[PDB]
Amino acid sequence: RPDFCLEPPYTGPCXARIIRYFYNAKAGLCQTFVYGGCRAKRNNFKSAEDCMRTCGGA
Amino acid sequence: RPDFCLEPPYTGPCXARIIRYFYNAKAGLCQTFVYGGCRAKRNNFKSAEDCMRTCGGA
Amino acid sequence: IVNGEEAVPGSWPWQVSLQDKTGFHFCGGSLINENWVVTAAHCGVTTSDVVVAGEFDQGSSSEKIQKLKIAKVFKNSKYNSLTINNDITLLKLSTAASFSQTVSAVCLPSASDDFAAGTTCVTTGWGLTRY
Amino acid sequence: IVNGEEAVPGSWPWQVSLQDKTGFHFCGGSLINENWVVTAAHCGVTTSDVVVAGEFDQGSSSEKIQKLKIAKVFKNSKYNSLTINNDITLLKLSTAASFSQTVSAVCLPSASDDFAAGTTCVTTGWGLTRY
Amino acid sequence: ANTPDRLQQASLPLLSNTNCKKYWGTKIKDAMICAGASGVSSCMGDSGGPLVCKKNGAWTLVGIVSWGSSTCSTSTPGVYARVTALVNWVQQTLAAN
Amino acid sequence: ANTPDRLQQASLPLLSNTNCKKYWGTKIKDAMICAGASGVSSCMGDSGGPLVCKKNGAWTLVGIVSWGSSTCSTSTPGVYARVTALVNWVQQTLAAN
Amino acid sequence: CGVPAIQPVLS
Amino acid sequence: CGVPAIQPVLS
């Protein structure tokens, strides 16, 4: 899977509180986190399904 | 909100690996966890939306 | 707000809470009249989200608030998603807010208005009090 | 399996992996012929899940496997969701498995078979190796 | 914890109902069979997989991974669906479909 | 990690672009205004809310909560959308809709 | 606009 | 049934 799947979730500099999904390689599945709303990294998805289709098994 | 929303997630005794959602009162939103497949507690939902509609803000 | 303090209930009556359909608070905003809210473009508001006006205590189920549906979202087309410049969106409400003791509008400036460096201003919201 | 050991690849050819549409492994199962898999009722399998046969290394994208759609789920109607008794479900494949060196069926017992206490048996799967 | 990539196996003994009920008591029902408590344990993601024993040289499905210790302790009996108690249901379902 | 139930407020000074660029350099663009670095900080969930100053006795919207320190440090400038640079766009949008 | 019915108190 | 083409090795 893409290496970006292994990066920790990134909230970024904006001040929103937006629920997103990131792949957690230690657990082997996607998990929610709070995103600041700008400058997302790639391990940042709007649904668990997108997240798992992109990073599942990394 | 219902007090069951404040219970930690419960994997239970069965040996499956099923993705479910539980409300995390410490973070204020629903997170994923792995459920064993039997004897669910009530803080255990099939989608983030069901979870937040039932426990959001507890 | 880190190291702020509790507001007097209802004393910031243009402050709204932007929530998803489940009631989750993801951004604030300001009433500028009965039909329009100004907020940030990076909040990513859609017509499925709702404007909650008149709120003080998001943990109180008994407070008298106005949940207002959003008719149309007007993101500034110059919002720059790399530099974060021009970070403004307007929300046109599908039902007007009802102004009251706890719900009313902030004034808007004119483009040439000058606010001096060092002026003591105020910001409000339900953001984190610790990161 | 805690404190087990890696199997010889393909030496348990009736072992299948039950996965959701994204490839997430949530349960195992056993082929009993080319069209049917037996698994546990509490796995909650639906026709949206898939039977993966011939697998060894779930982290190898190059392994030849058979992803098989499920036509119908037969949960034993006596499965007891409180006591976990009668914990069995059958999956009827919409397309037959293609049997081979690495895919074939386990035998079923007769209802009267006695397997004595203390018999050394084997269990297999991709479950956690530490809780 | 994450699951292993590669298929695992473990050898383990069948337990008598009597010896299994010394831990699980009346939670052991008539379509359950116990195995393990022997230094290995089925765990999360193993459910629905096989417990096989040789019968006349052929591996035969005696159990289906079902439930057990909630931390997958290797010193407590694992519980499996008892296929001899359910195989008549299996054959009837196949015959009708 | 959770938000306060009850609405918060903080007083804070406007910063000159020049003093703000002493921390954020060229990240400060022409429709941004800085405020704070004064022991308070906007943080996650404040975005899109108001920065108001008095103008002729009435509270006037000078900034919109936008971005800042990635840990909401109270000693760095907070950055807000500068409403004077954007109000002509606001009035045009209202007039057309 | 800009004049709350309930006056804010700042510290 | 029950006879793998590849023989298992049990330790």
Side-chain angles (χ1 to χ4, degrees):
Chain A
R1 286 296 205 175
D3 284 355
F4 69 71
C5 297
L6 310 180
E7 293 290 309
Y10 177 77
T11 64
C14 286
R17 171 197 187 210
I18 291 158
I19 298 173
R20 293 288 181 84
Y21 290 85
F22 74 104
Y23 183 75
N24 182 340
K26 214 197 159 170
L29 59 19
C30 290
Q31 182 65 280
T32 57
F33 78 108
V34 171
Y35 167 56
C38 68
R39 297 199 54 87
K41 290 185 176 184
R42 289 182 288 169
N43 191 13
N44 175 330
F45 302 89
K46 292 158 174 128
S47 69
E49 182 178 351
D50 291 354
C51 182
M52 286 304 279
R53 289 183 180 281
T54 304
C55 289
Chain B
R1 284 295 204 176
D3 285 352
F4 68 70
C5 297
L6 311 181
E7 294 293 310
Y10 178 76
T11 67
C14 283
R17 174 198 186 210
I18 294 157
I19 297 171
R20 293 288 181 82
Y21 291 84
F22 75 102
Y23 183 75
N24 181 341
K26 210 198 157 53
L29 67 158
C30 292
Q31 297 179 326
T32 57
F33 78 109
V34 172
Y35 167 56
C38 70
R39 297 199 54 87
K41 288 186 177 185
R42 288 179 288 167
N43 192 14
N44 172 331
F45 302 88
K46 291 158 174 127
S47 69
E49 181 177 349
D50 291 355
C51 184
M52 288 304 277
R53 288 184 177 282
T54 306
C55 292
Chain C
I1 299 176
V2 177
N3 204 25
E5 87 228 288
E6 203 177 281
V8 180
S11 64
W12 301 111
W14 47 84
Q15 168 84 59
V16 296
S17 162
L18 307 187
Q19 299 180 7
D20 69 19
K21 43 164 115 168
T22 77
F24 180 81
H25 166 99
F26 65 94
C27 272
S30 306
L31 285 159
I32 60 169
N33 59 47
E34 84 263 32
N35 294 113
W36 292 85
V37 166
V38 63
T39 187
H42 72 265
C43 291
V45 179
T46 76
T47 52
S48 300
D49 300 313
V50 313
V51 166
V52 174
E55 197 159 44
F56 168 65
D57 187 342
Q58 295 194 331
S60 164
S61 46
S62 72
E63 223 173 53
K64 290 178 184 182
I65 52 160
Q66 298 176 50
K67 280 176 163 288
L68 301 163
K69 298 211 202 165
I70 296 166
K72 186 153 179 15
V73 177
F74 299 89
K75 170 165 74 182
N76 188 313
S77 66
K78 287 179 198 164
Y79 171 61
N80 187 321
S81 70
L82 300 181
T83 71
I84 321 161
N85 201 34
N86 309 304
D87 190 15
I88 188 174
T89 282
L90 282 159
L91 318 174
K92 184 189 186 177
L93 304 181
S94 78
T95 291
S98 173
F99 279 7
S100 71
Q101 203 194 37
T102 64
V103 179
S104 58
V106 73
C107 301
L108 288 171
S110 268
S112 52
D113 284 342
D114 170 86
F115 302 87
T119 310
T120 294
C121 299
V122 177
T123 188
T124 55
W126 295 270
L128 296 178
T129 64
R130 158 177 61 85
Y131 180 84
Chain D
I1 300 176
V2 177
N3 199 20
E5 60 269 352
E6 202 177 282
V8 177
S11 64
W12 302 112
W14 48 82
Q15 169 84 58
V16 297
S17 162
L18 306 189
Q19 301 180 7
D20 70 19
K21 41 164 116 167
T22 74
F24 180 84
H25 168 102
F26 65 91
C27 272
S30 304
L31 286 157
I32 58 170
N33 59 48
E34 300 95 322
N35 296 282
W36 291 85
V37 164
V38 63
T39 188
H42 72 266
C43 290
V45 178
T46 77
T47 51
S48 300
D49 301 313
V50 291
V51 166
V52 176
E55 196 163 43
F56 168 65
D57 186 344
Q58 296 193 331
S60 165
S61 45
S62 72
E63 223 176 55
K64 284 318 211 180
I65 51 164
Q66 299 176 51
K67 298 178 108 175
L68 302 164
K69 295 216 199 167
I70 298 164
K72 186 152 179 14
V73 179
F74 295 85
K75 170 166 75 56
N76 188 314
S77 69
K78 290 177 79 187
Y79 170 61
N80 184 322
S81 63
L82 303 180
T83 68
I84 323 163
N85 201 32
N86 309 304
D87 190 13
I88 188 172
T89 282
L90 280 156
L91 320 175
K92 185 189 186 177
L93 304 180
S94 77
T95 291
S98 171
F99 278 9
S100 72
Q101 207 188 32
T102 62
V103 181
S104 60
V106 71
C107 300
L108 288 171
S110 183
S112 53
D113 284 339
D114 166 76
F115 300 87
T119 310
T120 295
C121 298
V122 176
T123 190
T124 55
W126 294 271
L128 297 178
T129 61
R130 75 151 192 100
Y131 179 85
Chain E
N2 204 3
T3 52
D5 285 339
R6 300 147 85 133
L7 182 63
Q8 310 286 301
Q9 60 184 31
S11 301
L12 71 172
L14 302 185
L15 307 155
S16 60
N17 283 344
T18 292
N19 285 335
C20 186
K21 292 185 202 190
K22 296 190 192 158
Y23 189 83
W24 291 118
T26 63
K27 303 306 181 181
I28 301 301
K29 307 300 182 188
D30 61 2
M32 303 177 179
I33 181 171
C34 303
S38 54
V40 303
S41 183
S42 300
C43 203
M44 296 206 74
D46 288 320
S47 272
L51 171 69
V52 283
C53 318
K54 281 194 188 172
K55 172 183 171 197
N56 301 319
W59 291 101
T60 304
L61 189 72
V62 171
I64 301 162
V65 181
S66 186
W67 60 275
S69 158
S70 74
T71 70
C72 304
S73 167
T74 66
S75 56
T76 63
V79 191
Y80 301 71
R82 179 187 295 272
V83 174
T84 56
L86 303 165
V87 70
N88 287 163
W89 171 87
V90 170
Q91 307 286 11
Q92 284 156 22
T93 306
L94 297 201
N97 296 271
Chain F
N2 202 3
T3 49
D5 286 339
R6 289 169 288 200
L7 181 65
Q8 310 284 303
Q9 62 183 34
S11 297
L12 70 170
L14 302 186
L15 307 155
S16 63
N17 284 344
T18 301
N19 291 331
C20 187
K21 291 188 200 191
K22 295 190 193 156
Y23 190 84
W24 293 118
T26 65
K27 303 306 181 182
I28 302 304
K29 307 299 181 187
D30 60 2
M32 304 174 183
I33 181 171
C34 301
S38 55
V40 303
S41 183
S42 301
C43 202
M44 293 193 92
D46 290 320
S47 270
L51 175 70
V52 285
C53 318
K54 298 210 201 160
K55 190 202 156 188
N56 289 312
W59 294 97
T60 302
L61 187 74
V62 170
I64 303 162
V65 181
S66 188
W67 61 275
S69 156
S70 289
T71 70
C72 304
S73 167
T74 61
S75 58
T76 62
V79 194
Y80 302 71
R82 180 188 295 270
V83 174
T84 58
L86 303 164
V87 71
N88 290 337
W89 173 87
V90 170
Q91 306 285 11
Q92 286 156 24
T93 303
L94 300 203
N97 300 271
Chain G
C1 64
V3 177
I6 300 160
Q7 168 150 335
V9 180
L10 314 160
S11 296
Chain H
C1 64
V3 172
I6 302 161
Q7 276 296 107
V9 179
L10 312 157
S11 293

